[PDB]
Design a protein around this motif. Structure first.
Motif, short mmCIF file in Angstrom:
data_model
loop_
_atom_site.label_atom_id
_atom_site.label_comp_id
_atom_site.label_asym_id
_atom_site.label_seq_id
_atom_site.Cartn_x
_atom_site.Cartn_y
_atom_site.Cartn_z
N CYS F 171 -25.47 45.95 -9.10
CA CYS F 171 -24.97 44.69 -8.55
C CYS F 171 -24.94 43.68 -9.69
N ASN F 172 -23.74 43.42 -10.21
CA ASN F 172 -23.57 42.57 -11.38
C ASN F 172 -23.55 41.09 -11.04
N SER F 173 -23.67 40.72 -9.77
CA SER F 173 -23.63 39.31 -9.38
C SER F 173 -24.79 38.56 -10.01
N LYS F 174 -24.47 37.54 -10.80
CA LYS F 174 -25.44 36.82 -11.62
C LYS F 174 -26.31 35.86 -10.83
N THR F 175 -26.24 35.88 -9.49
CA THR F 175 -27.12 35.06 -8.67
C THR F 175 -27.67 35.82 -7.47
N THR F 183 -20.96 41.45 -4.03
CA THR F 183 -19.51 41.53 -4.17
C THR F 183 -19.06 42.03 -5.54
N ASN F 184 -19.98 42.12 -6.50
CA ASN F 184 -19.65 42.58 -7.84
C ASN F 184 -20.37 43.90 -8.10
N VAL F 185 -20.04 44.91 -7.29
CA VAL F 185 -20.75 46.18 -7.32
C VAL F 185 -20.16 47.07 -8.41
N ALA F 209 -32.95 37.12 -16.14
CA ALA F 209 -31.76 36.87 -15.35
C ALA F 209 -30.73 36.14 -16.19
N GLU F 210 -29.49 36.17 -15.72
CA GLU F 210 -28.43 35.36 -16.29
C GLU F 210 -28.25 34.10 -15.46
N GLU F 211 -27.52 33.15 -16.03
CA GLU F 211 -27.28 31.85 -15.39
C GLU F 211 -28.64 31.21 -15.13
#
Ligand SMILES: *[C@@H]1O[C@H](CO)[C@@H](O[C@@H]2O[C@H](CO)[C@@H](O[C@@H]3O[C@H](CO[C@H]4O[C@H](CO)[C@@H](O)[C@H](O[C@H]5O[C@H](CO)[C@@H](O)[C@H](O)[C@@H]5O)[C@@H]4O)[C@@H](O)[C@H](O[C@H]4O[C@H](CO)[C@@H](O)[C@H](O)[C@@H]4O)[C@@H]3O)[C@H](O)[C@H]2NC(C)=O)[C@H](O)[C@H]1NC(C)=O
Ligand SMILES: O=C(C(=O)N1CCN(C(=O)c2ccccc2)CC1)c1c[nH]c2c(F)ccc(Br)c12
Ligand SMILES: O=C(C(=O)N1CCN(C(=O)c2ccccc2)CC1)c1c[nH]c2c(F)ccc(Br)c12
Ligand SMILES: *[C@@H]1O[C@H](CO)[C@@H](O[C@@H]2O[C@H](CO)[C@@H](O)[C@H](O)[C@H]2NC(C)=O)[C@H](O)[C@H]1NC(C)=O
Ligand SMILES: *[C@@H]1O[C@H](CO)[C@@H](O[C@@H]2O[C@H](CO)[C@@H](O)[C@H](O)[C@H]2NC(C)=O)[C@H](O)[C@H]1NC(C)=O
Ligand SMILES: *[C@@H]1O[C@H](CO)[C@@H](O[C@@H]2O[C@H](CO)[C@@H](O)[C@H](O)[C@H]2NC(C)=O)[C@H](O)[C@H]1NC(C)=O
Ligand SMILES: *[C@@H]1O[C@H](CO)[C@@H](O[C@@H]2O[C@H](CO)[C@@H](O)[C@H](O)[C@H]2NC(C)=O)[C@H](O)[C@H]1NC(C)=O
Ligand SMILES: *[C@@H]1O[C@H](CO)[C@@H](O)[C@H](O)[C@H]1NC(C)=O
Ligand SMILES: *[C@@H]1O[C@H](CO)[C@@H](O)[C@H](O)[C@H]1NC(C)=O
Ligand SMILES: *[C@@H]1O[C@H](CO)[C@@H](O)[C@H](O)[C@H]1NC(C)=O
Ligand SMILES: *[C@@H]1O[C@H](CO)[C@@H](O)[C@H](O)[C@H]1NC(C)=O
Ligand SMILES: *[C@@H]1O[C@H](CO)[C@@H](O)[C@H](O)[C@H]1NC(C)=O
Ligand SMILES: *[C@@H]1O[C@H](CO)[C@@H](O)[C@H](O)[C@H]1NC(C)=O
Ligand SMILES: *[C@@H]1O[C@H](CO)[C@@H](O)[C@H](O)[C@H]1NC(C)=O
Ligand SMILES: *[C@@H]1O[C@H](CO)[C@@H](O)[C@H](O)[C@H]1NC(C)=O
Ligand SMILES: *[C@@H]1O[C@H](CO)[C@@H](O)[C@H](O)[C@H]1NC(C)=O
Ligand SMILES: *[C@@H]1O[C@H](CO)[C@@H](O)[C@H](O)[C@H]1NC(C)=O
Ligand SMILES: *[C@@H]1O[C@H](CO)[C@@H](O)[C@H](O)[C@H]1NC(C)=O
Ligand SMILES: *[C@@H]1O[C@H](CO)[C@@H](O)[C@H](O)[C@H]1NC(C)=O
Ligand SMILES: *[C@@H]1O[C@H](CO)[C@@H](O)[C@H](O)[C@H]1NC(C)=O
Ligand SMILES: *[C@@H]1O[C@H](CO)[C@@H](O)[C@H](O)[C@H]1NC(C)=O
Ligand SMILES: *[C@@H]1O[C@H](CO)[C@@H](O)[C@H](O)[C@H]1NC(C)=O
Ligand SMILES: *[C@@H]1O[C@H](CO)[C@@H](O)[C@H](O)[C@H]1NC(C)=O
Ligand SMILES: *[C@@H]1O[C@H](CO)[C@@H](O)[C@H](O)[C@H]1NC(C)=O
Ligand SMILES: *[C@@H]1O[C@H](CO)[C@@H](O)[C@H](O)[C@H]1NC(C)=O
Ligand SMILES: *[C@@H]1O[C@H](CO)[C@@H](O)[C@H](O)[C@H]1NC(C)=O
Ligand SMILES: *[C@@H]1O[C@H](CO)[C@@H](O)[C@H](O)[C@H]1NC(C)=O
Ligand SMILES: *[C@@H]1O[C@H](CO)[C@@H](O)[C@H](O)[C@H]1NC(C)=O
Ligand SMILES: *[C@@H]1O[C@H](CO)[C@@H](O)[C@H](O)[C@H]1NC(C)=O
Ligand SMILES: *[C@@H]1O[C@H](CO)[C@@H](O)[C@H](O)[C@H]1NC(C)=O
Ligand SMILES: *[C@@H]1O[C@H](CO)[C@@H](O)[C@H](O)[C@H]1NC(C)=O
Ligand SMILES: *[C@@H]1O[C@H](CO)[C@@H](O)[C@H](O)[C@H]1NC(C)=O
Ligand SMILES: *[C@@H]1O[C@H](CO)[C@@H](O)[C@H](O)[C@H]1NC(C)=O
Ligand SMILES: *[C@@H]1O[C@H](CO)[C@@H](O)[C@H](O)[C@H]1NC(C)=O
Ligand SMILES: *[C@@H]1O[C@H](CO)[C@@H](O)[C@H](O)[C@H]1NC(C)=O
Lengths: 424, 123, 128, 123, 123, 424
Positions: F171-175, F183-185, F209-211
């Motif tokens: 799961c690449n979703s940064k939050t 949604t960014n699988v 984490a990012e962001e």
């Protein structure tokens, strides 16, 4: 014409690969090298001749020796798991002599934990060290486990097989030296009958050569490389421990029965061996022959440079001899009589890894006398003369004298090639 | 029979292409574990081959012709100087670089063959 | 198979500009285009243009190019096949000729030759 | 359905030859090791069968006709006194000696079939 | 190439039906035992699939048409509102109840196909 | 038109399943978590983006954490099988002090079973209890095995792979918070490089984490649920035991060599750590930020409610510290300077299952000083104010901070569907 690729399945093409082999035996007894947990040995050994084929061997990169070498060391640890551990024998021993092995006594706990007995038994001088009071040689080194007095040390034909889809490659050339390309190649599912004879200085019960005797090495001009000789005609060796020893059962725990040497009935004699002065002379001469085909000069044989490496050590009847072989290699070659060596005997045989555990070969009842064929030899070269001393205590050099003929290649039966052919 | 199992390893590809089912038969606790390990590995390498033959439309074939035209970049050699000269082992050492490229070419021809075959039986 | 609720009935005067909303629910908002249609008292129905909630692409009729401000949000996933988004519709030079009912229409399919065909309509909003 | 898994074991070969896919489905730490061992053995015996069907041109067949003429040395019995009388188990006890001979006859017919098929698509 | 391994998981079935051999390739001591266990399990699930394709006459196919007419009890939906709308994962959640019924329908059509094919080559 | 079923093989459809993964590493040393018995790690990690795809994750039902958690506990029992067992050390100890660790002495049997020596050594107060005469903390609890003084405790990147025919979903979703739909699988054969850092209260050497910094929980409104925080910028931690201790070899059996702490050369000092007051202030403020996005009110940090749970416990150089972290979480937030904690040290680290065995971390020679990035945090909420104390001694919460991105699904490539198609 036009050319399209057309795939062929089952093409004679192999790559050099390393896969885990499996063993096969023939077969109311046991064995340490689980020569019974192997799968049956195929009655019909399908040997296929690879005509026109020439393969590149190298008995010194051959991984089969590096794999078998670990299977033996593994097969031994496996056989000593259920056996009784002789740690309570690490007690202060009150040892006498006889005339050589000591006559010792020692307090040991019994089947009942708070009742003490004082047992007596004999221990070869090598199996004990002074602290006069004595102890066992290993107590400051490693744990010792008495080998189960039912598993045998018998070198059994072990047949090494490659998995389905792999291949083992033979070399039938009757003069093939160590490495290089062999022109008389054949493929085999399994190796021949291999005997895991863990020997030293003199190879026992091995596979002879055809035609003349061969000698193998890597860089023979490099003295720090062992020389593995192969004879073409075995020279008889006959060893024996004439002492008629006895076996006493000592209950030192619930079910833990340690077998010791009671005493010696009859004459006290000497453990030794015998070879023919004539046969070892002509055979030494044969070895002198090809020590010139790779050299010039004069050939000198001389004695070896813990005692396991300094003497012809092996197993006879179940006890490990250590025959001072100086009466074997003390001759210089320009251009009736039995040779007998003085063998000691040991019961505690440590391992060769790096400070772990040891073993205790339980005593054998009655007398012991075995007969073997010394078919190999491990030399070691060191002014104006070249002297070759018998070196070799490394275990993988032994298997190397038998796996030189074999090589592990994998099969890749997929083959594509262009032909005037297209599908509809 | 013929020569046997790999008996035509150093033979010409023309004679070796005959009787390929001799190498299609024989292709399929310290001792127990190292014996079972080789057993599972064997089934794997074999299935990887049948897997390839399947996604090439050759599932069940020993000699299988295809559609991919032979690119001369792989080898500008005649049919004669291959099947009557080079041995199968010599040959694929020469195609060794292009073997993973042809493998991809065979899969598109099988996927783009049944895709068309699908349109065929729509009528 | 979901609802496309819009804004109310906001009536302004000529020259100005009105914002019309179009909130989705019950269907993957990114999988189908969003079309904008209207029925004015003077003509019949007139197609204005569609937008792609995924490609971000816009294609309107040349009759409404230099007047329409068309945008979308980004769907908020409810389930693996559900979502909730919103499209926005503005106009430039507004007159009384543009008075009529307006709606948004979710596309028909995701592939083929009838992908954008305005299938699922909203509720309708009365302009000036 | 039909009788089930082996339900036609003592039935005539004519009725037993129908619905052979009922026995084609169900053909594929002390407890853990002896459970995994049976798992690997199963895949082996099964693959050995598919392996044979492959090098016979029957890969993917349940009933597969071939080219090898039926030698009467194997059995001089009529089609009638076999498929309407003997059960499949009775039959192959009679062919038991000649089973490893026919297996070889089927492989040459598949190798000598694609060898000819290769010449066919050369035109 | 195309999108990759499962890259058309949320794509339309029409585009996803193209290049199916990308998911046909990558389908085949505490660490050692748990590594060998996954190795044997992989060969099992794969063979179970090839096993099904075999007893369906599709052994060696990626796209395979059959005889069984599509019962509308399974889904009264058009070809258009399936292959250009639903994703492959959406689709088989809808056929989930009827999947074990169609599997049986495909085996009878393959058994009753070679049974007829047997009569064909009797002439 | 008519419709017949047509089978498709290799269709992108998966179910949620649980299968046994396998590990992969990169690699003249060892490791407890057999990060060497894993299969090679693939140089090219094929990450495939699943466009348009949306999957439903849940890091709290995720079985990969329940499986890895058992692999670590298993990898440890495996590493302590060959090592020497310290049961003869369960003797009455005559302990002194120094100025804290005791200075003890004790009769112990030697390599010879009937000869007694009296050895001396130092034992941290936590590793001993009064019966003045002393003993080891566990002797009335469980067997203790000294960790082999050659296996390392080094957190190595462990790559978790799913078998052929299975899949792991990223799961690449940064939050992405804990559970819900991503949604960014993307799909992966193996997870990224995972370090089995067995930590407590403060997550070490983890994946940032990012962001912005994220915080995860199940039912955050349920106070009996741990809160796993993830920082976006590591705050440096520096720990050390400045004492220059020595290692003495004690022969208490054939091959069984127990390593004890000789004495302290030079200054007697204190085991402690260091973090930046400024960086932990702004980072504490960042954690204060999103303690409002899920709350209102005021945020209070307070100390923890055997000592393994009460302090930041971890491994530094090979010895297990227990840093009193009260100088870390004692601040209330409305709306130079090094923070140093007082770390004790232990050598006997019991297990967490239910009355079985323990371990003895052999002493490390010389001084010890390690540097780590505290990237996570495990809080615990308990009037008008909400106070969050650092809780967390559970081992599976740690892996949970890294396996939140991943999910195990099985592949089912069989797909049937109707098309205008029939066979002949
Ligand atoms: C994820 O899911 C989304 C939504 O389901 C998928 O996006 C949709 O894909 C389908 C099929 O690929 C699209 O339908 C097609 O629409 C085109 C229209 O494009 C043309 O016209 C546009 C406006 O005039 C123009 O922008 C296009 O120009 C290019 O540049 C834009 C820049 O944004 C780029 O985005 C475009 O892709 C173009 O490359 C272009 O000129 C239409 O032409 C198609 O019809 C043709 O193709 C079909 C077969 O596909 C054929 O049957 C027809 O006869 C004709 O030949 C087709 O209708 C749809 O528009 C997309 N968007 C939606 C539905 O909102 C996406 O593909 C999925 N991705 C993955 C990885 O799964
Ligand atoms: O397999 C072996 C091994 O080392 N060997 C060499 C000794 N050997 C002989 O035949 C021999 C030859 C010359 C002199 C004395 C003995 C048989 C095999 C072991 C593997 N683990 C072992 C262990 F934990 C303790 C003791 C041993 Br002994 C082994
Ligand atoms: O794997 C473990 C285990 O319990 N752990 C937790 C401790 N640990 C640390 O790094 C640590 C963290 C904070 C304070 C002290 C130590 C590594 C792994 C065991 C599995 N069987 C065990 C046994 F039979 C005895 C002793 C142990 Br210890 C284990
Ligand atoms: C080894 O020493 C033991 C004593 O520890 C001898 O055993 C004794 O032998 C004498 C006769 O020599 C007997 O009178 C005693 O009764 C024996 N004692 C026990 C306890 O048996 C043993 O004979 C010696 N053997 C050898 C070969 O030296
Ligand atoms: C070499 O081979 C001979 C023959 O197999 C071995 O002699 C056997 O020894 C065992 C036990 O020592 C006896 O049970 C057999 O009866 C002997 N066989 C014969 C024919 O006498 C000999 O031990 C082997 N040598 C080595 C070193 O293993
Ligand atoms: C710990 O105690 C031991 C005694 O059990 C100390 O060892 C003695 O130290 C004195 C000097 O302090 C020497 O004179 C003795 O010869 C030592 N005895 C032995 C047996 O070594 C040891 O120094 C103490 N160490 C610490 C750090 O307290
Ligand atoms: C966090 O990672 C750092 C860097 O890998 C670790 O520091 C290493 O510690 C070992 C032994 O303590 C040394 O052999 C390495 O040389 C150190 N690396 C560097 C770059 O200094 C640190 O120990 C890790 N922390 C934890 C708790 O595992
Ligand atoms: C054990 O004692 C012997 C004395 O015979 C000595 O040679 C050997 O080095 C000692 N080994 C160890 C490990 O202390
Ligand atoms: C190959 O070697 C075998 C045995 O060494 C021998 O019988 C045979 O004649 C040899 N053949 C050739 C072609 O050298
Ligand atoms: C020893 O002598 C000959 C081989 O020259 C043979 O009769 C006997 O079997 C040999 N023993 C072996 C090879 O063990
Ligand atoms: C064996 O012969 C080859 C040539 O046939 C030679 O290159 C190689 O050095 C030889 N090996 C030894 C040990 O002399
Ligand atoms: C063999 O060893 C000598 C030195 O002992 C060295 O000069 C020579 O290069 C070596 N040859 C090979 C083939 O390794
Ligand atoms: C060995 O001693 C035993 C007595 O224990 C005796 O019965 C046997 O005959 C002796 N054998 C020999 C060969 O001396
Ligand atoms: C060794 O013993 C065997 C059998 O007893 C005998 O045939 C052979 O001549 C003996 N050889 C020597 C050298 O003692
Ligand atoms: C054998 O080695 C010894 C040790 O240096 C030496 O004195 C002796 O001369 C050597 N014998 C021969 C024959 O080379
Ligand atoms: C071997 O025997 C010779 C005399 O035959 C002797 O000088 C030598 O010291 C002996 N070797 C050992 C290691 O005892
Ligand atoms: C070498 O040792 C043998 C032992 O059998 C002996 O006969 C011979 O004389 C020795 N060689 C000498 C002393 O040069
Ligand atoms: C050599 O040993 C054999 C073995 O029994 C023996 O028969 C023979 O008499 C011995 N010969 C001499 C000269 O000692
Ligand atoms: C041959 O292969 C090269 C790449 O290796 C490609 O660029 C070229 O187009 C190919 N030519 C033909 C005729 O297939
Ligand atoms: C394959 O590539 C290598 C690259 O180093 C090249 O040397 C070799 O010649 C190539 N093989 C062929 C058959 O082109
Ligand atoms: C039948 O088989 C026998 C061998 O079993 C063979 O000799 C004979 O030629 C065969 N006859 C026919 C007609 O195939
Ligand atoms: C098979 O061979 C055996 C040989 O003993 C024979 O008795 C038996 O009758 C044979 N079977 C058939 C069916 O011919
Ligand atoms: C459809 O399936 C139902 C059972 O699910 C069956 O009763 C019916 O006959 C089938 N109809 C057709 C047209 O196949
Ligand atoms: C499958 O059966 C269940 C029975 O509970 C039903 O709820 C579900 O709707 C069925 N699925 C389909 C696609 O008909
Ligand atoms: C062991 O003794 C300690 C005393 O420090 C005590 O706290 C603990 O409960 C005891 N455990 C058992 C199992 O008796
Ligand atoms: C998905 O996430 C990656 C890394 O988090 C990012 O690089 C990429 O742009 C993202 N893509 C989408 C469509 O969100
Ligand atoms: C600690 O600091 C940074 C990450 O912010 C990086 O340079 C270093 O590798 C980190 N150490 C880790 C992640 O072990
Ligand atoms: C994560 O977000 C989803 C909505 O996207 C929500 O349902 C879920 O409760 C959130 N998780 C937490 C721990 O707040
Ligand atoms: C969370 O916990 C509270 C009580 O602590 C409970 O009332 C509520 O229903 C829980 N919510 C969920 C989603 O579990
Ligand atoms: C630690 O003590 C040893 C003496 O055992 C000494 O050689 C070394 O220099 C000391 N190191 C430090 C950093 O004090
Ligand atoms: C920790 O140590 C590293 C390297 O020694 C240093 O760069 C960093 O500033 C230190 N941070 C703290 C908070 O002590
Ligand atoms: C921390 O907890 C203690 C224990 O009750 C309490 O007295 C103190 O007020 C707390 N501190 C804060 C800042 O909440
Ligand atoms: C931690 O340190 C504080 C003072 O900094 C002290 O009051 C507290 O008792 C310590 N905690 C423990 C468990 O010793
Ligand atoms: C909390 O502990 C820290 C320790 O570094 C101290 O600086 C701070 O004053 C404490 N907070 C108080 C006493 O309110
Ligand atoms: C904080 O710790 C680092 C670690 O070496 C040190 O260099 C620095 O001087 C320390 N700062 C203070 C104010 O103590």
């Amino acid at each position: 014409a036009k050319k399209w690729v057309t795939v062929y399945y089952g093409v004679p093409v192999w790559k050099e690969a390393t896969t885990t082999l499996f063993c096969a035996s023939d077969a109311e007894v046991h064995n340490v090298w689980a020569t019974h947990a192997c799968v049956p040995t195929d009655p019909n050994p399908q040997e296929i001749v690879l005509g026109n084929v020439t393969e590149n061997f190298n008995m010194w990169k051959n991984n089969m020796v590096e794999q078998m070498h670990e299977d033996i060391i593994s097969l031994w640890d496996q056989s000593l798991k259920p056996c009784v551990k002789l740690t309570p024998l690490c007690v202060t021993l009150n040892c006498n002599n006889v005339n050589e092995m000591k006559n010792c006594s020692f307090n040991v706990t019994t089947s009942i934990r708070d009742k003490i007995k004082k047992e007596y038994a004999l221990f070869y001088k090598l199996d004990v060290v002074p602290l006069t009071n004595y102890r066992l040689i290993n107590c400051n080194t490693s744990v010792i486990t008495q080998a189960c007095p039912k598993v045998s040390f018998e070198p059994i034909p072990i047949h090494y097989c490659a998995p389905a889809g792999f291949a083992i490659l033979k070399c039938n050339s009757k003069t093939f030296n160590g490495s290089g390309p062999c022109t008389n190649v054949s493929t085999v599912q399994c190796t021949h009958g291999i005997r895991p004879v863990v020997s030293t200085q003199l190879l026992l019960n091995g596979s002879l050569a055809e035609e003349e005797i061969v000698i193998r090495s890597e860089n023979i001009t490099d003295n720090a490389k062992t020389i593995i000789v192969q004879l073409n005609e075995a020279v008889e060796i006959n060893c024996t421990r004439p002492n008629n020893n006895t076996r006493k059962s000592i209950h030192i725990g619930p079910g833990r029965a340690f077998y010791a040497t009671g005493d010696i009935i009859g004459n006290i004699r000497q453990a030794h061996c015998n070879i023919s002065k004539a046969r070892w002379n002509e055979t030494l001469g044969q070895i002198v022959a090809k020590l010139e085909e790779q050299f010039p000069k004069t050939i000198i044989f001389n004695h070896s440079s813990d005692p396991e490496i300094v003497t012809h050590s092996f197993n006879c009847g179940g006890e490990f001899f250590y025959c001072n072989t100086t009466p074997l290699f003390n001759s210089t070659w320009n251009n009736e009589q039995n040779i007998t060596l003085q063998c000691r005997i040991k019961q505690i045989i440590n391992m060769w890894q790096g400070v772990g555990k040891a073993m205790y070969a339980p005593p054998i009842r009655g007398q012991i006398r075995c007969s073997s064929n010394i078919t190999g030899l491990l030399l070691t070269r060191d002014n104006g003369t070249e002297t070759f001393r018998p070196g070799g205590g490394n275990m993988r050099d032994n298997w190397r004298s038998e796996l030189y003929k074999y090589k592990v290649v994998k099969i890749e039966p997929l083959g594509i090639a262009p032909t005037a052919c297209k599908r509809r | 029979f013929i020569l046997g199992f790999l008996g035509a390893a150093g033979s010409t590809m023309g004679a070796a292409s005959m009787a390929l089912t001799v190498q299609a038969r024989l292709l399929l606790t310290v001792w127990g574990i190292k014996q079972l390990q080789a057993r599972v590995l064997a089934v794997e390498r074999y299935l990887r081959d049948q897997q390839l033959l399947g996604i090439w439309g050759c599932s069940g074939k020993i000699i299988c012709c295809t559609n991919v035209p032979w690119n001369d970049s792989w080898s500008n050699k005649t049919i004669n100087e291959i099947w009557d000269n080079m041995t199968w082992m010599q040959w694929e050492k020469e195609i060794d670089n292009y073997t993973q490229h042809i493998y991809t070419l065979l899969e598109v021809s099988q996927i783009q063959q049944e895709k068309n075959e699908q349109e065929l039986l729509e009528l | 198979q979901g609802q496309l609720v819009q804004s109310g009935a906001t009536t302004t005067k000529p020259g100005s500009s009105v914002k019309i909303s179009c909130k989705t629910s019950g269907y993957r908002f990114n999988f189908y285009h969003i079309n904008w249609i209207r029925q004015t008292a003077g003509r019949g129905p007139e197609w204005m243009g569609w937008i792609s909630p995924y490609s971000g692409d816009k294609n309107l009729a040349p009759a409404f190019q230099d007047r329409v401000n068309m945008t979308t949000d980004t769907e908020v996933p409810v389930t693996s096949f559900t979502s909730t988004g919103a499209a926005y519709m503005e106009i430039r030079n507004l007159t009384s000729d543009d008075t009529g009912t307006y709606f948004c229409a979710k596309g028909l399919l995701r592939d083929g030759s009838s992908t954008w065909l305005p299938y699922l309509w909203g509720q309708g909003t009365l302009l000036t």
